[PDB]
Amino acid sequence: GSHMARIKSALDNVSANVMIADNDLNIIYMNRTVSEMLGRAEADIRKQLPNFDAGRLMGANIDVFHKNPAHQRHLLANLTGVHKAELNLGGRRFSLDVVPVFNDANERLGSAVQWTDRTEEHRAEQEVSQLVQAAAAG
Amino acid sequence: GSHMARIKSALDNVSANVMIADNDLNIIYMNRTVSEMLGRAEADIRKQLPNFDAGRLMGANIDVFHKNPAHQRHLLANLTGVHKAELNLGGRRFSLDVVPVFNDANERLGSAVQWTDRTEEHRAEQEVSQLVQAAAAG
Ligand code: HEM
Numbered sequence: 387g388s389h390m391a392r393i394k395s396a397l398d399n400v401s402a403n404v405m406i407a408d409n410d411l412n413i414i415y416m417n418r419t420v421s422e423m424l425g426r427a428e429a430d431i432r433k434q435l436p437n438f439d440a441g442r443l444m445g446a447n448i449d450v451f452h453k454n455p456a457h458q459r460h461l462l463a464n465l466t467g468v469h470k471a472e473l474n475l476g477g478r479r480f481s482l483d484v485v486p487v488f489n490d491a492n493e494r495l496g497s498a499v500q501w502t503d504r505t506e507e508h509r510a511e512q513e514v515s516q517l518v519q520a521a522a523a524g
Numbered sequence: 525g526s527h528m529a530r531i532k533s534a535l536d537n538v539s540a541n542v543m544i545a546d547n548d549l550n551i552i553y554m555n556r557t558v559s560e561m562l563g564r565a566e567a568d569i570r571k572q573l574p575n576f577d578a579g580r581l582m583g584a585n586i587d588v589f590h591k592n593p594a595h596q597r598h599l600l601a602n603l604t605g606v607h608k609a610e611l612n613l614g615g616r617r618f619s620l621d622v623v624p625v626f627n628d629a630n631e632r633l634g635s636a637v638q639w640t641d642r643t644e645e646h647r648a649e650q651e652v653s654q655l656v657q658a659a660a661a662g
Pocket residue numbers: 405406407413438448451452453454455458461462469470471472473474484497498499
């Protein structure tokens with residue numbers, strides 16, 4: 387359907403990482419920003435997920451990527467509003483934001499995930515964290 | 525005990541917002557950074573929590589601040605590693621990171637929370653989020 391055209395228009399060049407999987411968890415869209423970023427980080431990511439091929443991403447099922455794919459599968463299948471969480475990707479830390487997406491006829495197209503790098507914030511936290519616990523007890 | 529001295533030394537001037545409550549949820553420490561920041565944001569915060577008095581913070585019980593204080597109370601009481609979440613504070617968005625803290629004799633002193641502003645990231649997410657859902661269905 388032409389939902390796909392509207393999507394490319396609105397997101398293709400926006401500043402955010404954006405990716406969409408269908409109801410089968412098949413990647414059916416990814417914007418330029420996220421495409422560039424996953425390109426660079428491929429080797430680093432491969433250390434974590436040996437199967438990750440950046441160039442083989444469209445069409446891909448994202449189960450491969452998930453520790454227990456059954457868990458996202460359920461999660462997604464019930465998502466109603468936004469889900470907020472974090473992931474490690476290639477030793478970098480991202481906040482992830484997932485929302486379901488629907489066509490004009492309110493059918494569910496799938497799920498939109500948006501990744502925001504927060505590696506620095508996250509390392510800082512780790513520091514302050516151990517620094518505090520070190521101080522509290524020599 | 526002198527755990528308190530080591531804490532002030534290590535954290536008083538560090539770049540992070542840091543605050544510690546005891547096993548009773550009484551604020552027993554707050555660093556300079558978080559003190560300055562909560563000062564500024566007091567009026568904004570008061571819109572959300574009418575009781576919030578910035579200047580009356582040491583000694584304060586943080587139940588007042590929590591929607592169902594019973595929930596953090598349980599949470600904290602079982603915390604073993606780090607807890608990561610988010611909060612609204614005075615219409616600003618913060619990532620929060622909570623770790624238990626212990627003295628030299630492994631007694632539990634209480635809980636250390638660290639707040640990291642992510643209002644901008646969070647508004648961006650909201651945008652991209654609705655932008656996507658708008659595009660997917662006119
Ligand atoms: C539309 C695309 C995708 C969606 C909708 C999706 C969905 C999700 C969701 C909902 C979570 C929730 C974590 C939680 O709350 O427990 C998650 C975690 C995670 N995702 Fe994805 N994912 C997608 C693509 C990817 C890709 C491309 C990767 C890696 C290349 C990936 C790797 C991970 C990792 C490492 C986690 C952390 C927990 C785990 O490994 O199971 N995801 N994902």
